[PDB]
Design a protein around this ligand. Structure first.
Ligand code: RD4
Ligand code: RD4
Ligand code: MN
Ligand code: MN
Lengths: 137, 137
């Protein structure tokens, strides 16, 4: 039986800027680094950056909607979004759903999000206003 | 600051087979399904499957090393891996470069992994068998 997400691994084209982004800009904890990667944590999340020459710096119009959302409190959301904006980090989508969300790109174009709110909160909102064709289990 | 993965969203090309894969084959909990997506959980993980006409079924030699690992116990690992194999689930990697792991593909070629062990355990293993150039902080 699967018990949760063990780790998220992002392929990166250049290790140093990716470490700068996740550790210094986003505030994650750097636990180890080697010639071809790094291990960081963000709360319970184990993140691995893996240096991969196959990684392309990918514009958001050329990737699908697969994306990785990090939790932040409502109280901290606006100042963190402002930090990313000051750093010139690009936005790939505007928020139109429930709960605050800031949609931003990593240095290789990985699609990231800051989100406030749990699955339970989303399900509660959906029960009141179900999406088209929505069924609950 | 950031604390945890809030959710993982995977773009999918065909919603029904993807829901079946995550719910029926992998055993995740399905909470809701609608015309264009589904919400599942795997322990604390909030997984969203999002129907995306841009998603392509991608052979593993065409995608980078970005991948998503799920936790499984030492007692369950081998039989779950063997069940995926017997069910014909495609693979993408054989060499155990990061401990006890099984590397498999979802219906769209998302790179998945079963892994036994925490970040702390991987760091301890790496102290004995470090990756080239490894430094610990
Ligand atoms: C018929 C297969 O079972 C479902 C369950 C939930 C939603 C949907 C749907 N197409 N909106 C279909
Ligand atoms: C989505 C398919 O779900 C399952 C679940 C369990 C077994 C099998 C199988 N045919 N070996 C398939
Ligand atoms: Mn999202
Ligand atoms: Mn892995």
């Amino acid at each position: 039986m699967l018990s949760g997400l063990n780790h998220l691994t992002l392929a990166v084209s250049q290790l140093a800027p990716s470490v700068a982004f996740y550790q210094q800009l986003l505030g994650m904890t750097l636990h180890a680094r080697w010639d071809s990667g790094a291990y960081l944590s963000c709360g319970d999340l184990w993140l691995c950056l893996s240096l991969d020459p196959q990684r392309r710096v990918t514009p958001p119009e050329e990737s699908d909607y697969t994306h990785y959302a990090f939790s932040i409190s409502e109280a901290d959301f606006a100042s963190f979004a402002a930090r990313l904006e000051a750093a010139g980090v690009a936005v790939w989508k505007l928020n139109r759903s429930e709960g605050a969300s800031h949609y931003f790109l990593d240095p290789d174009g990985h699609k990231l999000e800051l989100h406030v709110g749990s699955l339970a909160q989303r399900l509660a909102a959906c029960r009141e206003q179900p999406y088209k064709g929505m069924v609950f289990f």
